Amino acid sequence: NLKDKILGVAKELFIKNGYNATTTGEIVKLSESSKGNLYYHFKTKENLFLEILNIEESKWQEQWKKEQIKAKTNREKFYLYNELSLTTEYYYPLQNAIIEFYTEYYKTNSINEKMNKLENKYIDAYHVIFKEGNLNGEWSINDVNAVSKIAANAVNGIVTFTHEQNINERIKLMNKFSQIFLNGLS
Amino acid sequence: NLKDKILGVAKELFIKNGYNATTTGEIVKLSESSKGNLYYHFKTKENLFLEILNIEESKWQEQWKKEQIKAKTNREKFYLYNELSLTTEYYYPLQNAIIEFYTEYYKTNSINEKMNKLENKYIDAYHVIFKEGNLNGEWSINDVNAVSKIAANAVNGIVTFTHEQNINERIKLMNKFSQIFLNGLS
Ligand SMILES: CCNc1cc2oc3c/c(=[NH+]/CC)c(C)cc-3c(-c3ccccc3C(=O)OCC)c2cc1C
């Protein structure tokens, strides 16, 4: 494909090198397509990167819905989502390029637009879990939105900053966190 | 002193121009030293930088040692420590060079190992809070090493992926997290 085969070459690049580290010159060569091409449906570079973040967020959200069936109660869904977070191939892998990207493009009032666009799509799973858990009487959370943002970010932090200790240790610290957290909601 | 001069000159060089832009040639001349001296003390730019990172972490501790006195209980120190980590990054100078360096040498066996020892120093601040909170029946934690690692990364998450929200909202969410988390230990 075209725009679709570029979005891949980019993803690979942003993940492998970082937001700046990778350039359009690079993208184009390996993607194999005149630069101008990129300019059509991919206005700027933020547009391309912001693009990938959306697809990646969506791919992940989709994977989770197709896997959350294995968790009967919302309590389990909390535990599970946080566990899978550590192993997916989606979105989380380029959380580091997001750190760059923000610091490097953080002074454009276009900053909080698509950038908050994601916030909402990223804390969604938690909103459902807690909301539904509230209905489902698994706990009573007066401020679902606050708790979802906290959980989302706390978890993202655990997945992103412990990227060296052996995988199974991670799975366990994560489960201890999920435990302490939910325990604090009651 | 000349070693100290170099570190000082280099730190400010990193702040203004960032990690990748700062050159050792500039570091050598502005500190009135020499390539050879720089080599003898640090071997490489990467290494000189990690060195600064270590000096900075000690200042942080010294700072924390003087600040925690304002918090009588450990429950209090936890809240206070999480809030300081959030507010200071708003204006920590090197923060950028760090984000820049952090990703550059994030897949490097050598550097990544040294960096992990650096975070360990951060993580200890929590260890102390939890061990002491134990000896005071503020809570009972039988896996302090684990809970410390969780606090650190959870907090880091909240501090890192939340720059779009306004500072009052971020601080409110952080104190809420501290509350939720702390509650899950009783
Ligand atoms: C009141 C003066 N304020 C300070 C504020 C700080 O805010 C920081 C925010 C961050 N924001 C999230 C992306 C990250 C990553 C590191 C920080 C460090 C840090 C940087 C390099 C090497 C060691 C440390 C360090 O302190 O390491 C162990 C504690 C830091 C240090 C001091 C003194």
Coordinates of C-alpha atoms in Angstrom, one line a residue, chain A residues 15-18 93 95-96 98-100 102-103 106 111-112 115-116 119 122 142-143 145-147 149-150 153-158 160-165 169 172-174 176-177 179-186, chain B residues 95-96 99-100 102-104 106-107 112-113 116 119 141-143 145-147 149-165 169 172-186:
Chain A
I15 CA 10.3 3.1 17.9
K16 CA 13.9 2.1 16.8
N17 CA 15.5 5.6 16.8
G18 CA 13.2 8.1 18.6
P93 CA 6.5 0.7 22.7
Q95 CA 5.8 6.1 24.8
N96 CA 9.4 7.2 24.8
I98 CA 6.2 10.6 22.9
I99 CA 8.3 12.0 25.7
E100 CA 10.7 13.4 23.1
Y102 CA 6.3 16.6 23.6
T103 CA 9.4 18.3 24.9
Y106 CA 5.6 21.6 23.5
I111 CA -0.2 21.1 21.7
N112 CA -3.2 20.3 23.9
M115 CA -2.5 15.6 22.6
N116 CA -5.6 15.7 24.9
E119 CA -5.6 11.5 26.9
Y122 CA -5.9 6.3 26.6
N142 CA -17.0 8.9 43.4
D143 CA -14.5 10.4 41.0
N145 CA -12.4 10.4 35.8
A146 CA -9.7 11.3 38.3
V147 CA -9.0 7.7 39.2
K149 CA -6.3 9.3 34.7
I150 CA -4.2 8.4 37.8
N153 CA -0.6 7.3 34.1
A154 CA 0.7 5.4 37.1
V155 CA 0.6 2.2 35.0
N156 CA 2.2 3.8 32.0
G157 CA 5.0 4.8 34.3
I158 CA 5.5 1.3 35.6
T160 CA 7.8 2.6 30.6
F161 CA 10.4 3.1 33.3
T162 CA 11.2 -0.5 34.3
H163 CA 12.2 -1.6 30.8
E164 CA 15.2 -3.6 31.9
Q165 CA 14.4 -5.9 34.8
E169 CA 9.6 -9.5 37.7
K172 CA 4.8 -9.2 39.4
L173 CA 5.5 -5.7 40.5
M174 CA 2.6 -4.7 38.3
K176 CA 1.3 -5.8 43.4
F177 CA 0.5 -2.3 42.2
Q179 CA -3.5 -4.9 44.2
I180 CA -2.5 -1.9 46.4
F181 CA -4.4 0.4 44.1
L182 CA -7.7 -1.3 44.0
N183 CA -7.3 -1.9 47.7
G184 CA -7.1 1.9 48.2
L185 CA -10.5 2.4 46.4
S186 CA -12.2 0.6 49.3
Chain B
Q95 CA 15.4 17.8 32.7
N96 CA 15.5 18.3 28.9
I99 CA 15.1 13.4 28.3
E100 CA 17.4 13.8 25.4
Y102 CA 17.9 9.1 28.3
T103 CA 16.5 8.1 24.9
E104 CA 19.8 8.4 23.0
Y106 CA 18.4 3.8 26.2
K107 CA 19.3 0.7 24.3
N112 CA 21.6 1.6 30.7
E113 CA 23.1 -0.4 33.5
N116 CA 19.6 1.9 36.6
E119 CA 17.3 5.5 39.8
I141 CA 4.6 -3.5 54.6
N142 CA 6.5 -6.8 54.4
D143 CA 7.8 -6.2 50.8
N145 CA 11.8 -3.2 48.3
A146 CA 8.9 -4.0 46.0
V147 CA 6.5 -1.2 47.2
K149 CA 9.9 0.3 43.2
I150 CA 6.2 0.6 42.5
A151 CA 5.8 4.0 44.1
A152 CA 8.8 5.4 42.2
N153 CA 7.6 4.3 38.8
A154 CA 4.0 5.0 39.4
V155 CA 4.8 8.5 40.5
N156 CA 7.2 9.0 37.6
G157 CA 4.4 8.1 35.3
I158 CA 2.1 10.8 36.8
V159 CA 5.0 13.3 36.5
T160 CA 5.9 12.5 32.9
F161 CA 2.8 11.8 30.9
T162 CA 0.7 14.6 32.3
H163 CA 2.3 17.8 31.0
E164 CA -0.9 18.8 29.1
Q165 CA -3.0 19.3 32.2
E169 CA -5.1 19.7 38.3
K172 CA -4.6 17.5 42.9
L173 CA -4.3 14.2 41.0
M174 CA -0.9 13.5 42.5
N175 CA -2.1 14.0 46.1
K176 CA -5.1 11.8 45.3
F177 CA -2.8 9.1 44.0
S178 CA -0.8 9.4 47.2
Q179 CA -4.0 8.9 49.2
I180 CA -5.3 6.0 47.1
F181 CA -1.9 4.2 47.2
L182 CA -1.4 4.8 50.9
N183 CA -4.9 3.5 51.6
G184 CA -4.1 0.2 49.8
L185 CA -1.5 -0.6 52.4
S186 CA -3.8 -0.6 55.4

